[PDB]
Design a binder for these strands. Structure first.
Ligand SMILES: [Mg+2]
Ligand SMILES: [Mg+2]
Length: 758
DNA sequence: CGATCACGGGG
DNA sequence: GCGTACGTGATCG
């Protein structure tokens, strides 16, 4: 009708699917139902006569037989060529996985197509429906929880001790222990606290629930405790419970009628941080410090009853900043959803490769272009092993006053001008074609390629938005249009990468190679022009470069670089654009996407080097941090080498505290299901043998002891370690922990692993 | 060696 | 749900 679409799903009623379109119309929540949309797949047949055998194929589901309800001969395009396929209709979406392989196996069937598109996404495309359109203002509520945790406990063993929420009315805490603070609501039990959260959510009726890692912590924990306590969480606008969907090796939680906006996957994509803790994220965006109160401090305060006001303040600030962050990051995700035509829930949890693919599937429908299939495992593997011809090793040592230049806005223009598309690649009876330099791939000029055509329209639309922005007096429209033009830039700058993405439907190795080859001519021009101006290029890859004027004043480097970007863009034709990304006080480069820098404010910025993860010992992580600090903060590689040498000697002489040697690894399945027994599994099996209920999710802490053979047979549970009896493996902690953590970094300064010991 | 298995965020 | 990440690095067998 007239509302803004925020989501879509389907329900089954009397065994038949019903699409639900969740809308917001002038502040009101509305649900539209559609019983008429039918599931389907396509089948390419060897001959039209075959349909009589194919329409008679059946399968089984829910104890009943599955049939093809209707067949329809249709004319479409495949790889820029007319094709005749049969549209096979099914009653229920779940009929598609049940019957698709029985159609594909048929000797008269050449191939099948569009057999793995989810019904709700199939519906939005086919009906031309775009989520997040209009000026409809949504409501937001941030939610967070605090729990009682002890090292290595099964997930959900300890109770939820606090629940916090925040919106514009303020940040509040619900707890079941007496804390005298103005924003704290004290209730009688964990059960009563969870029921109060349910009431707040039902009363505030937010369109968007903001969490920080709610997909993999807050909501699975709430569901675990609600199950324990035997209470329901009717948070859905249809009174349904939050729904845990297995998205990869992890989880994603949906709340029907709403948008569960988990900031963790969103921020992980948007900015570069070594660790995405809420406190690190908040500081990077708002330039303010946020205190972290660790799990052990929380457990100690809860159990002893001392210092609970500190824990309540931590819980409050967690909800307060989650709200603040949500408001900051939601507008761009809303514009991306709109652009790609899929709900924010799905779009906020996806890579740019999937954003491109959703955009392309919709455009293929609009253009009557049959979509190619996602590859099988063998093809996906063959794609990962493909070698690309045509980005040198970076300069060694420590450099000062570094400018970063970004090339990414160059590639959409190359795709368009050279008609780079899988449907135009090495076409027969082509009258005119473009030949890629060095690699020689031919792209037909006779018709615009599917992908160049779409990119051309995206770039044109962005230029119209930018023009409308200059001519606007309304700062509200200007702010909105700024988000819209940034969403196009992000989607357009993702096509180059998408061509080489192994899971892509419109994958094209030769397209990616050719864009690289044509792109290189401009990169080489940028490099020569930089060097003619006294700049030294320290590092260069397909995405950008780092450069300096050796021994020049920093303000002179910045000014010359800004003046250079303005100059080159005046020389580059069309929408080919170079961007000044930033300036760094110092930096060093190891290899492709492995480097470390420090800006003028003293913030260290790295790519592909830092090892902040629980399965690496503290001694290795601490030494690595010390090495980066000595190099970047002190400009002293000699100090860094001496730090490594001192740590290794201390390890050899058993001078390192055993607490800095603990390795943590999660159990992810029943112990009997393991095919390879790593040290944490060997430790786990002994724990289960002692009567410990070992379950997936439990994190095993261990220390590697001195001895013969694989580390599996010498690992000990941290709770069993006796410093007066057990001797840790110094050679393991040196060669497998500390030295790999620092050897890549120090390779940039001409050191090998063997020069980092006395 | 190829195969297998872990990481992130949260408490 | 017409589904189940990603890319990378250590250790087992
Ligand atoms: Mg959904
Ligand atoms: Mg919290």
């Amino acid at each position: 009708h007239a509302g803004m679409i925020i989501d879509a799903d389907y329900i089954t009623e009397d065994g038949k699917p019903i699409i639900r379109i969740f809308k917001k119309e002038k502040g009101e929540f509305k649900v539209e139902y559609d019983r008429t949309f039918r599931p389907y797949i396509y089948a390419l047949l060897k001959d039209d006569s075959a349909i009589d055998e194919v329409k008679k194929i059946t399968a089984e589901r829910h104890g009943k037989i599955v049939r093809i309800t209707e067949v329809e001969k249709v004319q479409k395009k495949f790889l820029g060529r007319p094709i005749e396929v049969w549209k096979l209709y099914l009653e229920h979406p779940q009929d598609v996985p049940a019957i698709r392989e029985k159609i594909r196996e048929h000797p008269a069937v050449v191939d099948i197509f569009e057999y793995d598109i989810p019904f709700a996404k199939r519906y939005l495309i086919d009906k031309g429906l775009t989520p997040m359109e209009g000026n409809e203002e949504l409501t937001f509520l941030a939610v967070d929880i605090e729990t009682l945790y002890h090292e290595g406990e099964e997930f959900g063993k300890g109770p939820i001790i606090m629940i916090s929420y925040a919106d514009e009315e303020g940040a509040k805490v619900i707890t079941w222990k007496s804390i005298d603070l103005p924003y704290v609501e004290v209730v009688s039990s964990e059960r009563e606290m969870i029921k109060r959260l349910v009431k707040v959510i039902r009363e505030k009726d937010p369109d968007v629930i903001i969490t920080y890692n709610g997909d993999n912590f807050a909501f699975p924990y709430l569901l675990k405790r609600a199950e324990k306590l035997g209470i329901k969480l009717p948070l859905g606008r249809d009174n349904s419970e939050p729904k845990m969907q297995r998205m990869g090796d992890s989880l994603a939680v949906e709340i029907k009628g709403r948008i569960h906006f988990d900031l963790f996957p969103v921020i992980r994509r948007t900015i570069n941080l070594p660790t995405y803790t809420l406190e690190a994220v908040y500081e990077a965006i708002f330039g303010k410090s946020k205190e972290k109160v660790y799990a052990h401090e929380i457990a100690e305060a809860w159990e002893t009853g001392k210092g609970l006001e500190r824990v309540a303040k931590y819980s409050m600030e967690d909800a307060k900043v989650t709200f603040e962050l949500g408001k900051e990051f939601f507008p761009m995700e809303a514009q991306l959803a709109r652009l790609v035509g899929q709900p924010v829930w799905d779009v906020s949890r996806s890579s740019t490769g999937n954003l491109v693919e959703w955009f392309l599937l919709r455009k293929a429908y609009e253009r009557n272009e049959l979509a190619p299939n996602k590859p099988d495992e063998r093809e996906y593997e063959r794609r990962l092993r493909e070698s690309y011809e045509g980005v040198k090793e970076p300069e060694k040592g420590l450099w000062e006053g570094i400018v970063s230049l970004d090339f990414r806005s160059l590639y959409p223009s190359i795709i368009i001008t050279h008609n780079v598309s899988p449907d135009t690649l090495n076409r027969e009876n082509c009258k005119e074609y473009d030949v890629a330099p060095q690699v020689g791939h031919r792209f037909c000029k006779d018709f615009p390629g599917f992908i160049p055509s779409l990119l051309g329209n995206l770039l044109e639309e962005r230029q119209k938005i930018k023009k409308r922005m200059k001519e606007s007096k309304d700062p509200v429209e200007k702010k909105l249009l700024d988000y819209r033009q940034r969403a196009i830039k992000i989607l357009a700058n993702s096509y180059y990468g998408y061509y080489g993405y192994a899971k892509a439907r419109w994958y094209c190795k030769e397209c990616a190679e050719s864009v690289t080859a044509w792109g290189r001519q401009y990169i080489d021009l940028v490099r020569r022009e930089l060097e003619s101006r006294g700049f030294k290029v320290l590092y260069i890859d397909t995405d950008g470069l780092y450069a300096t004027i050796p021994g020049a004043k920093h303000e002179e480097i910045k000014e010359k670089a800004l003046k250079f970007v303005e100059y080159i863009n005046s020389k580059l034709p069309g929408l080919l654009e170079l961007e000044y990304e930033g300036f760094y006080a110092r930096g060093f480069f190891v290899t492709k996407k492995k480097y470390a820098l420090i800006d003028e404010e003293g913030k260290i910025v790295t790519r592909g080097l830092e090892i902040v993860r629980r399965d690496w010992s503290e001694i290795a992580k601490e030494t690595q941090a010390k090495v980066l600090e000595a190099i970047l903060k002190h400009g002293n590689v000699d100090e860094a080498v001496k730090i490594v040498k001192e740590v290794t000697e201390k390890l050899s002489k058993y001078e390192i505290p055993p607490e800095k040697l603990v390795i943590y690894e999660q159990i992810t399945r029943p112990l009997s299901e393991y095919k390879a027994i790593g040290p944490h599994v060997a430790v786990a099996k002994r724990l289960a043998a002692k009567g410990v209920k070992v379950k997936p999710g439990m994190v095993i802490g261990y220390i590697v002891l001195r001895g013969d053979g694989p580390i599996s047979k010498r690992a000990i549970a941290i709770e069993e370690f006796d410093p007066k009896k057990h001797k840790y493996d110094a050679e393991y902690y040196i060669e497998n922990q500390v030295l790999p953590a620092v050897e890549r970094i120090l390779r940039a300064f001409g050191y090998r692993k063997e020069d980092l010991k006395y």
